[PDB]
Amino acid sequence: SMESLAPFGYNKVSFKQTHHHYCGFYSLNILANIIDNVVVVNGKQYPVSDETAIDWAYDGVDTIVCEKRLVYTEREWPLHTPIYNINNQIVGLVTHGVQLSSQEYCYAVQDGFNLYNNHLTGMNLIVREKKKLIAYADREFDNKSELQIYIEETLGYGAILYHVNKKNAQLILHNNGLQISNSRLRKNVFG
Amino acid sequence: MESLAPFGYNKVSFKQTHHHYCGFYSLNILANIIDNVVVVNGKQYPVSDETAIDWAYDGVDTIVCEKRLVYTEREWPLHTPIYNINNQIVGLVTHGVQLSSQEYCYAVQDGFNLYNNHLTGMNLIVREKKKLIAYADREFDNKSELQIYIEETQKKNCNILGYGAILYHVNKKNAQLILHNNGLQISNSRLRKNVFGNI
Ligand SMILES: Nc1nc(=O)c2ncn([C@@H]3O[C@H](CO)[C@@H](O)[C@H]3OP(=O)(O)OC[C@H]3O[C@@H](n4cnc5c(N)ncnc54)[C@H](O)[C@@H]3OP(=O)(O)O)c2[nH]1
């Protein structure tokens, strides 16, 4: 391919046959890891924190879920900028960050294949704050008794990433109203 | 009322009223491991800094759980209660592994502090990974073989085997959880931890 690293896009779905799925972009080759907790963006070094958080990226059919390392900056990173390690090897492409304050930003950088990853097929992940005690399929319940009623009373696959104040990431997959899996990742959620 | 019972009997009653731990039902939320120590049959055992992915089938659901490894020179009988240093029950002994004539290893769940995945209506299968790509219930050397399987399944799909779960590993490393249904791929979790047990 002529496009080595290509950000996700609806019209780039043919890249799934030729490129690896990173969280937010396709890559022709396996990318390098972060070395000594530093990333290099536009010629400036940025220390990488010890914090991680769950990020996600829809590519038009699948959702890539990835535990990424958090990088706190005092400067905005333009989207799709290449990220290098201190050995001048490309680590990835800049994805969407968050502006903490007027002069504060936080970006999430995937560190190769070192951390949690989940490739969800044919599902557009929904992220929402947990409002009740129990989450099950695409519904929420106050107690087990309300849950048993729904199960006995009960289209398409779905994926929901739950959090409470960006904490305790909880990923639920469901199909036709039935629960498939309920994974408590014990990680923060980025955003 | 059995407040802390191992998987394998009367699941209908337990599943509506008890919390699902990896291998046993508990009426209450169980205590955590305090100061990296568990107590089994009156003896204190230091808990290592190692974890591994374990699983337990209760007869309809599979509980997947990252557990903490405890090395011991003494065998722990199945179902023996496990306590913390406050004499608070933390669980029941599950199956371990024997590393040497004098050395054993058990995996102990530390409450709900670590990774936990509840698989509904599925019996997990553990398999050593032998090809580069895992997809649905199959393995493929490359994406061209994968694309053939996808396209042929799109043309004709006779798989009505239902929902399945496969835990892949390479020499007990690189835990990878594949969920699938009727020849379709659902989710591919890279857990990065070792897989516990005689595998
Ligand atoms: N992207 C990625 N992130 C990780 O964190 C990671 N940890 C390990 N690995 C393995 O590295 C090998 C490559 O050296 C891969 O094979 C992979 O093992 P696996 O995790 O067993 O593989 C499933 C393949 O299968 C891919 N697919 C999934 N669906 C499709 C589809 N419809 N069409 C084409 N490919 C599909 C899926 O994206 C994927 O392959 P790619 O990421 O390279 O694209 C990782 N790969």
Residue numbers in the entry:
A (entry chain B): 0 to 153, 161 to 197
B (entry chain A): 1 to 199
Q: What does the original paper state about this entry?
A:
Group four is formed by poxin proteins from the genomes of several additional lepidopteran viruses: betabaculoviruses (also called granuloviruses), cypoviruses (double-stranded RNA viruses in the family Reoviridae), and betaentomopoxviruses. The new poxin structures trap a post-reaction state following 2′3′-cGAMP cleavage and allow direct comparison with the catalytic mechanism of VACV poxin. Strikingly, despite sharing <21% identity, each poxin structure contorts 2′3′-cGAMP in an identical strained conformation. Unlike the catalytic triad of histidine, tyrosine, and lysine residues essential for VACV and AcNPV poxin cleavage activity, the active sites of T. ni poxin and PrGV poxin are divergent. The T. ni and PrGV poxin enzymes share the conserved active-site histidine but lack a tyrosine residue entirely. Further, the T. ni poxin protein shows substitution of the VACV lysine for an arginine residue, whereas the lysine is conserved in PrGV poxin.
New poxin structures include the alphabaculovirus Autographa californica nucleopolyhedrovirus (AcNPV) poxin from Group 2, lepidopteran host poxins from the moth Trichoplusia ni and the monarch butterfly Danaus plexippus in Group 3, and the betabaculovirus Pieris rapae granulovirus (PrGV) poxin from Group 4.
